[PDB]
Amino acid sequence: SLLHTFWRLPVAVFFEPHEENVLRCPERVLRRLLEDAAVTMRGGGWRED
Amino acid sequence: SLLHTFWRLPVAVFFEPHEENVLRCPERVLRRLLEDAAV
Amino acid sequence: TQNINTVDMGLGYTSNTCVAYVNRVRTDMGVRVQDLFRVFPMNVYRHDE
Numbered sequence: 001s002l003l004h005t006f007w008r009l010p011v012a013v014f015f016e017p018h019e020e021n022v023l024r025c026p027e028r029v030l031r032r033l034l035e036d037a038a039v040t041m042r043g044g045g046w047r048e049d
Numbered sequence: 050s051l052l053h054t055f056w057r058l059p060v061a062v063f064f065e066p067h068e069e070n071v072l073r074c075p076e077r078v079l080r081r082l083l084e085d086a087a088v
Numbered sequence: 089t090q091n092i093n094t095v096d097m098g099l100g101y102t103s104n105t106c107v108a109y110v111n112r113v114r115t116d117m118g119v120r121v122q123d124l125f126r127v128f129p130m131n132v133y134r135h136d137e
Contacts, residue, residue, distance in 0.1 A: 007132040013059035014071055021054040 015021070025031070062071075074082070096102075 005132065005134050006130050010064055010136075011061055012064065014062045015054050015056060016060055018055040021052070023052040026050050
């Protein structure tokens with residue numbers, strides 16, 4: 001009747017999937033870090049040379 | 050940066066390995082993988 | 089049904105028996121040791137790993 005240890009279920013707060021649960025993106029920093037990569041991967045390096 | 054989910058209150062799970070597991074690396078492994086993707 | 093009634097008719101032990109003959113064994117006389125996990129199906133450790 002003392003401090004023993006048993007197998008409780010591991011409680012973890014999660015989220016079941018839905019159709020309108022969106023992953024929002026930081027536009028003004030991460031798209032503007034993607035901007036220079038998108039403009040620098042157009043010209044050259046086509047893997048056909 | 051943080052996402053927008055529909056169900057505002059989070060759910061306790063059975064934690065079936067028969068289903069898909071849920072992104073189970075803690076903040077230590079996140080910061081370590083940040084260093085590994087850096088160097 | 090048939091209600092029968094028996095009353096003893098002797099002070100001392102009037103009926104003797106003895107373990108006399110043995111045919112076979114049901115067990116194996118083996119050494120396959122039982123497991124403590126099924127006889128205690130609730131106890132686990134604390135750390136999950």
